[PDB]
Amino acid sequence: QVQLQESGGGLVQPGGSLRLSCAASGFTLDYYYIGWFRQAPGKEREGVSCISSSHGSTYYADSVKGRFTISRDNAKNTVYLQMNSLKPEDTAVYYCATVAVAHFRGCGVDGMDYWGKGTQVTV
Amino acid sequence: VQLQESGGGLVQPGGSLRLSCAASGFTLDYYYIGWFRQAPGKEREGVSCISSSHGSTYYADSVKGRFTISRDNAKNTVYLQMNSLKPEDTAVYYCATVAVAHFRGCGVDGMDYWGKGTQVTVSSHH
Amino acid sequence: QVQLQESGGGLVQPGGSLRLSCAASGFTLDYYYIGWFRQAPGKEREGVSCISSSHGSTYYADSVKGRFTISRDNAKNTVYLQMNSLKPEDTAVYYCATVAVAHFRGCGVDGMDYWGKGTQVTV
Amino acid sequence: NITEEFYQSTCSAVSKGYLSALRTGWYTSVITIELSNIKENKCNGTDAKVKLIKQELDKYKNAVTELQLLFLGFLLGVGSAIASGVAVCKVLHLEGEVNKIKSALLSTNKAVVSLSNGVSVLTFKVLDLKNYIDKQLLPILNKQSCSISNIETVIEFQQKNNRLLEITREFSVNAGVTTPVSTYMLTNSELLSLINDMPITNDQKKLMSNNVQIVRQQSYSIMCIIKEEVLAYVVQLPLYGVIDTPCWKLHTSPLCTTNTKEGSNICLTRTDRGWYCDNAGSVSFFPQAETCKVQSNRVFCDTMNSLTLPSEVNLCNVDIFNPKYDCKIMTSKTDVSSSVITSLGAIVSCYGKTKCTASNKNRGIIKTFSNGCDYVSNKGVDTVSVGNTLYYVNKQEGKSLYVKGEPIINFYDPLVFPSDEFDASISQVNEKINQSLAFIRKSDELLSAIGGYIPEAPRDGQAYVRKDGEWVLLSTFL
Amino acid sequence: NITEEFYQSTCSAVSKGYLSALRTGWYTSVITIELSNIKENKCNGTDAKVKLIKQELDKYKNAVTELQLLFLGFLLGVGSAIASGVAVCKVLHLEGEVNKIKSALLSTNKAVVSLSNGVSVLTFKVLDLKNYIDKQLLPILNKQSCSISNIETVIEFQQKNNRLLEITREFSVNAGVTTPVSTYMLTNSELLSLINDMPITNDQKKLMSNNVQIVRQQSYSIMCIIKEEVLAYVVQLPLYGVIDTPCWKLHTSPLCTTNTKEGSNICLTRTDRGWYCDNAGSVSFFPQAETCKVQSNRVFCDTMNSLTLPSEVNLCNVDIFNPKYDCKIMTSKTDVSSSVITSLGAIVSCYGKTKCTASNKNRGIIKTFSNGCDYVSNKGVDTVSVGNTLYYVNKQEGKSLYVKGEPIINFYDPLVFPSDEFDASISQVNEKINQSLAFIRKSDELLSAIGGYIPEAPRDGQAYVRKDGEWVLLSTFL
Amino acid sequence: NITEEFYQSTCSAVSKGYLSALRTGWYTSVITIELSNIKENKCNGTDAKVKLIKQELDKYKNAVTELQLLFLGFLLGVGSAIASGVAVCKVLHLEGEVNKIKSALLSTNKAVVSLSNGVSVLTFKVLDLKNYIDKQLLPILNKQSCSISNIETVIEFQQKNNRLLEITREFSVNAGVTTPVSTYMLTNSELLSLINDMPITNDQKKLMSNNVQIVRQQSYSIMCIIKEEVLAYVVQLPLYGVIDTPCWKLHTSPLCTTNTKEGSNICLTRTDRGWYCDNAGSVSFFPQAETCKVQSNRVFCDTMNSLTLPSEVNLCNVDIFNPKYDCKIMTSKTDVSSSVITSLGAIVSCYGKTKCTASNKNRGIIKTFSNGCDYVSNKGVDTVSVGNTLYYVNKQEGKSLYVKGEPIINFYDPLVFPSDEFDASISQVNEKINQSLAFIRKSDELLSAIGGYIPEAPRDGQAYVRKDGEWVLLSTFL
Ligand SMILES: *[C@@H]1O[C@H](CO)[C@@H](O)[C@H](O)[C@H]1NC(C)=O
Ligand SMILES: *[C@@H]1O[C@H](CO)[C@@H](O)[C@H](O)[C@H]1NC(C)=O
Ligand SMILES: *[C@@H]1O[C@H](CO)[C@@H](O)[C@H](O)[C@H]1NC(C)=O
């Protein structure tokens, strides 16, 4: 039932911006925390952004803090990651993930229960 | 259930006076009896509590030595003897009681039943 | 049912050796701790040696430690106390005692539940 | 004077000769520490002693900042233990209120201040760090050029400040509420004079003073406020409003049948075990005896953990079948062996193949228990063993009385015995037994006299009549 | 804003207006102390100051060796509280693992290191004793000829070493696991920066920082390893994944009939008391309300002590007979008196001959309760007394609502009321009632048919027929 | 070596490979501090160092004055944990008794003295403050003209006195009884030599020395007496008379049917959960596993918290219906979801609408549980979630075995299933089913006679006969 589907990946020039979208199906956001993760080639997968679905409170890891911002639309049941001032090191596959707020155990790959199939960004 | 203080009247300074407190509605053995006073303009304050069975007593500092409290199980009555009265002792004196089970200290915040009071005046005028 | 019978007591010369035996009946050693105690004439009775039936782990009081050694034969249901280099001050009646390991509360006269009838030793 | 009675009939024992001490109320005193208000530390000097003072001064500031952010028990009611301390603390937050206190303790360390509508609280300034820092360390840290204080002042400051740090420490890891109240909160001398200056009777003062360590364990210290260089925490002290009334302790253990066939045995246990104290014409009952503490013959309990019972509850001891009080019991078939150590002896519930013995220090085993519930006094007995469990017995002096009686478990017919009533009682068990017994009393009555009735005549187109015990065709008589 | 509702109908009360703070997960942090490796202490000098240093160093040495050797609650599941912390400690014992951290904290006291398969842990060097002893005391204790250090260094070493001694002290009597986490384990500044650097949302960071004293009580410090002059212990911190959802507290008390015959009364009690919080579309129910701590309108809980319930469980408050949730209750005939102090008042269950009153500070007794279940708000009321038990009420501000309704205990016919259901519920009670009713519908049905039957007709050679109630000879009608 | 087996049939799991360490008895040691008897302090000098000494000396005197004034657990018996220590302490108050001890430790700090009728106790002088003050401080405070001691003596006195102060501190808020026993009461070196000189086997001394931190949690310090400049407290130490026997831990969880209608399901839970250890031909059973402390694969327990059971109790794991032991269980209709975390995995009882999953750290959710009772091993699984409750699993190494089998709750006919047995077992439930089966078979028998016997004929002047089951007018056949 619960599935996630990222889109918006593509070839970007350096200094450019790109927005990814994450459509939730099989559940509603309100009861959940939504996160964006990325894995660049050969590298370990790392957290990037968590958001509270209800309150809209947000979490940004140190590496993108200031450049990246995450948002959510409960009515459209979709979570967005805006990326500004993109750098080549941001080239990665970007994954959408979620967890029930009841089971929330921190942002981070060891703290996730459901995973999207990903979307590729190349700078 | 009733409490009735008596013995109030005009006293000259240095004079003595005895108050009586008639208990009805309970038996003494199970209770603590206290005497309280409220002086003019002043908040009401404790003066003396006593255990009915054993006779153990409590005297506030202000009257310790001058005032003595006693109880008569047979007459079901509690007495406060006041000696060497001072004009500053002028006040309305109240009788109060509490179940020993509910004892929470002597003191106005520690009372469950209250008498209607009796006026004492220490003064020379007339 | 449960009984103990010590034997091997006798007159020894100082520096001589003697072995005491303690026959258990009514129980098996495995579930128990076996102890040796002594009482010299007129003196209060004092502990001398305890042993674990299962592991064979041993206890020697300070006074006899080194000179006396204790052993057990599970097959013969018997506990032995070997005494070497005997001194006249060791003259005493030697008692065998035991306690269930379930009830073990230390070696010592206040820690015993069953007692043999004793055997006299004179140096 | 302590005596004890064992009731063979009910596998229970009563210990008597005890004197009461029941906490009935709470008194709240306000303990204060006068503080120094020191923002920045002005000194460029790298003198070792002055260097130490700033480190010591910092522990003081840090402490301030931390403080600035700041069986039958199931039948009991539910209280709010510090509801009273908290209410006083609430009063302490009003603006005019602190000024009153600060002013009250201006020329003395002890003072009475009346709060709101009539509550009279005793107030205590136990430490004046304001005066100490302002008369000692002020010359050395109010100026760049710093007066290199003697080494003994550093130590003294550490000594005086140390009390503040532990208090802060206690409150920081206890969310502002501690129990027992430590001697950092209140020294022995401070507490003793507090009790003496308390609005209570002479009987209470004597009792409390000889047992201050218990008083401490039954007290609460409640962190309340830091404002206008005054630190104040509320100390909530137990009031023992009932003293020297008789008390007794009831011990119970399972009483079971001892039939040979395993699992065929039935058991019953008095559930009304605990401490009992005469109180105001009634009896105060404390089912969880661990909430009471006994020191020699004085017993300290808290009425928040009691029931108030009619004095006829005592009848369960003499007559567990008395018609005036329904003695409470539970039933089961779990016949495991155990012992209950009493004040002056030991109850032994020994069943099945369990090995149960009693021993002496020097003599060893002196009594072997048979199956059933039994008892031995502490005279000449030092230890008891039930199964793999060793029990040391109490060696207190006192006489025991063995009250003989038929074990009441023998009065029940096992075929209709309700062995799985847990929250039960004598009357309740009987009621259920009568219902199981009633339907057999009547069903047998009905199976009889049922055969005195005539069966149905065969169902055909023919008519029948009765003769000689059998149906005969009507056609015959035609 | 706190309000409360009392349901006369069920002798229960709900306090609402509370905001949630539920621990949903765990964060594991790694706390480190850099150590000095000093085997023997070489000095023959009997100078007083150096004599002191070897004794303190021995205290230093001694600490290391010790560390080197190193109602419905019954329905809850069973967790492993430090399972996450212990697991991380287990990883730290792996070869090379310690080396990673030491290198990370080479140039900073704070650093992130990712363990085994992906867990990212925060690491913190909070005390560098290696650096202090090796740059301070090494000149004085690395040589026979010893440099008689100034007295302030002696003092300073004691100050720095003291924390280590206390950390060690705590672990030694706690088998390497302590709670609450003391300020020796983690200072206020240390904890705060750890919280700021955590991989969590902004809502969580704020909650923990404004309530650090609570955070200490819900954290574990787990002594882990001493190896290659690095000492490291894991501090396991609570993650509060649920904040600011509505919470309410359910209070309950026994409801009995008030018939004159005391043994003729029946009682019923809602058993579902405890804390309730909306959580992820369901309701988290904490039957042991004592595992939660309340500060104003914020309630701190642990999901390990919860049930996850359908939100319809709330219906038991408005309609205990609702068809959507089977509200839980217990039954008995034990009409004993007690009181429950609520958030904004007090519930009083007063039965039999018990005296029940509530009093005010200055006024005294202002309401005397009649037998039954009743309630009073905390406005103008200071104490409540039931039997010999005095209760102080909560004095927090808030409005109470008295919800009238017929006590539901009145709806049961006492002759078939199952008074021995302890872990029961509404539907379950109905079920037994149906069975007692089934057996009466049929027993009367059967007795009605058996009482309808005729005795045997007389036994002679003549035939009989029935008329006017007795057998008459057929010969008569012929 | 730790292994585990899960039994699907009874919704339970056993973890094995553990080795025993059981406290079976008590040893009482007497610890002493030699005290100085200094009434007044004679000195008029206002020298800073001497000024400090009188304050420190006063703390010593103050300390002296304070010291001068001084699941199936419910089936367990009740002991007096420090009855033995107190008894030894009682003997110590007798006259001359203290004099005996003081003389024994005259030329040594360690000596054995036998009390009354044969008890041999170990004695320990751990601190000689008499000697320190009388050889150090006596020259400075025995005279008006006072010898201004070097600053290093002041420091030294504080260190030595501090132990007395901390020791004094612990007892004052614990009424002379402390637990666990701190390192102030008895240092590690002190304890180790105590262990070596104890009348115990070599195996026990070794066990205690490698686990000294455990010894402290299971020990008591009992304040006893201060008289004739001797301070003495009794320390009561655990004796582990059982070591290295096989142990296993039984985990259980509710087993319910999974029918769609929520009110139609029945549940059953094994109540015999806890720790089990082979012991002296029997099995020691500890129902409250929290009374045991685990160190790696060694488990420390107290026999005071045990039952002594036949070894056949192990059979309940392989065959819960075995005829040789009545396995204990409870029954209910409360099908709530929960989990029990085992040594090497997790039991999941997932019923109703509960969300139940298992996840890995990096992979996320890897298993979704269906309704029923199930299990997952800790290999490749990191967390389990049941409803809103998250459980972290233990990551210890060991193999798990899943033993498949039909859930035994399926073997019961719900129409006669006793869903309200709390303190039950297999045979008892069967036994009760029998009473329930009896009462339906017989009731039917009685109902098996509602119509086969004949009713009364109508009461009129007419005669009747029997035909086709009903009465027919005689006039008809005429
Ligand atoms: C139980 O039945 C007996 C029958 O003799 C009766 O005397 C007794 O009063 C009954 N008890 C109850 C509680 O109904
Ligand atoms: C109990 O019986 C009543 C009346 O027949 C019925 O309405 C109700 O559904 C029954 N309860 C159950 C649980 O079947
Ligand atoms: C239950 O009763 C049946 C009757 O047929 C019998 O076979 C069985 O042994 C009984 N079980 C117990 C435990 O009494």
Author numbering:
A (entry chain D), C (entry chain F): 1 to 52, 52A, 53 to 82, 82A, 82B, 82C, 83 to 100, 100A, ...
B (entry chain E): 2 to 52, 52A, 53 to 82, 82A, 82B, 82C, 83 to 100, 100A, ...
D (entry chain A), E (entry chain B), F (entry chain C): 27 to 96, 137 to 544
Paper text:
RSV F is a class I fusion protein that is expressed as an inactive precursor, F0, which is cleaved at two sites by a furin-like protease, leading to the formation of the disulfide-linked F2 (N-terminal) and F1 (C-terminal) subunits, which associate and trimerize to form the mature prefusion F protein6. The isolated antigen-recognition domains of these unusual antibodies are known as single-domain antibodies (VHHs). Here, we present the isolation and characterization of two llama-derived VHHs that potently neutralize RSV A and B subtypes and selectively bind prefusion F with picomolar affinity. Structural studies reveal that these two VHHs bind to a conserved quaternary epitope composed of two F protomers.
F-VHH-L66 also bound to prefusion F with sub-nanomolar affinity. However, compared with F-VHH-4, the F-VHH-L66 association rate constant was lower (3.3 × 105 M−1 s−1) and the dissociation rate constant was higher (5 × 10−5 s−1), resulting in a KD of 154 pM. To precisely define the epitopes recognized by F-VHH-4 and -L66, their crystal structures in complex with prefusion F were determined to 3.3 and 3.8 Å resolution, respectively. The complex structures revealed that despite substantial differences in CDR3 sequence, F-VHH-4 and -L66 bind in a nearly identical manner to a cavity formed by the boundary of two F protomers. This cavity is bordered by antigenic site II of one protomer and antigenic site IV of the neighbouring protomer, and the location of this epitope between the binding sites of palivizumab, 101F and AM14 explains the ability of the VHHs to compete with each of these antibodies. F-VHH-4 and -L66 each bury nearly 1,200 Å2 on prefusion F, with approximately 60% of the total buried surface area on one protomer and 40% on the adjacent protomer. The CDR3s of F-VHH-4 and -L66 are submerged in the interprotomeric cavity and therefore mediate the majority of the interactions with RSV F. The main chain of both F-VHH-4 and -L66 forms a hydrogen bond with Thr50 of F2, the residue mutated in the escape viruses isolated for both VHHs. Two rounds of selection in the presence of F-VHH-L66 and four rounds of selection in the presence of F-VHH-4 led to the isolation of a single type of escape variant that had a threonine to asparagine substitution at position 50 in the F2 subunit. F-VHH-L66 failed to neutralize this mutant virus, whereas this virus was still susceptible to inhibition by F-VHH-4, although this required 300-fold more F-VHH-4 compared with the parental virus.
